[PDB]
Amino acid sequence: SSVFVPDEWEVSREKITLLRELGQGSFGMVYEGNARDIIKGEAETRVAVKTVNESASLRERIEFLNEASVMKGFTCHHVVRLLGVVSKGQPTLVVMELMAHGDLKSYLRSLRPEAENNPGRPPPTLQEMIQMAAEIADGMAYLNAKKFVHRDLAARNCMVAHDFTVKIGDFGMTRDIYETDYYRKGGKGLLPVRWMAPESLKDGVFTTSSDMWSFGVVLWEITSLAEQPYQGLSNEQVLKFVMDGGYLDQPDNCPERVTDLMRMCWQFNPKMRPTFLEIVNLLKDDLHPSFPEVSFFHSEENK
């Protein structure tokens, strides 16, 4: 009987309760919910639950499959945690840790002084921006260490927790690079042009170096409160611009320290760009006391 070979990630639908919509993805919905007894020691746990639209295409379902699969293998404080999967029936539910403040792009925009949904606090201080950068870089370092390339690092894909900790999310485009250290894209597909390195736009080659290029754009989004990169240029113009050696300007009043990081990330030669561990190292002396207690960088696993 099938019962004798279960899936350890399987969660009973009975334990999940949906409260409200957190956001809408391209082929599904993300809901805030509460789950009963899904974590030892926790009677109830706040969660985010993603569903797949009944109308989702095969390509979209294949993507979600990879996404959930890669998440299962990750254990990092700075990477969004998968908690379980409800597959006993329809619709399939992917249960993840709740990131109360949603995606970084939305969060940043809400911090604009004139924002209708301003939470009543100032935009990110220099200290807060460095902390965000270090958390994103640590999560990315872990991913790189596990031999995966994200390919879609952007503020929209970083999530913010109740305590404002930023973590890497959206592993839909993530690829295994264990054997060769790179991924060469096959056919045609939807690519985040404004976040891509020149060599990826040119040859379709993705490496941890191209993820570093994207990290630089994320710093640009943080320092501009999520404005649109290359506003005024179409995707086709951006592709040509970047391949020709172009890059973004420093946002108005961008802290010199962050500007320096962006300069490192936007070098044309991927081999001259820094690594995620090197970014965390540059920032390690001015972070929250708890960082060494939870980071991949300070962990025994970073060997």
Binding site: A154, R156, K188, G189, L190, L191, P192, V193, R194, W195, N235, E236, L239
Partner: peptide
């Protein structure tokens, strides 16, 4: 959008 089919 944020993506381009290419």
């Amino acid at each position: 959008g944020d993506y381009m089919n290419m």
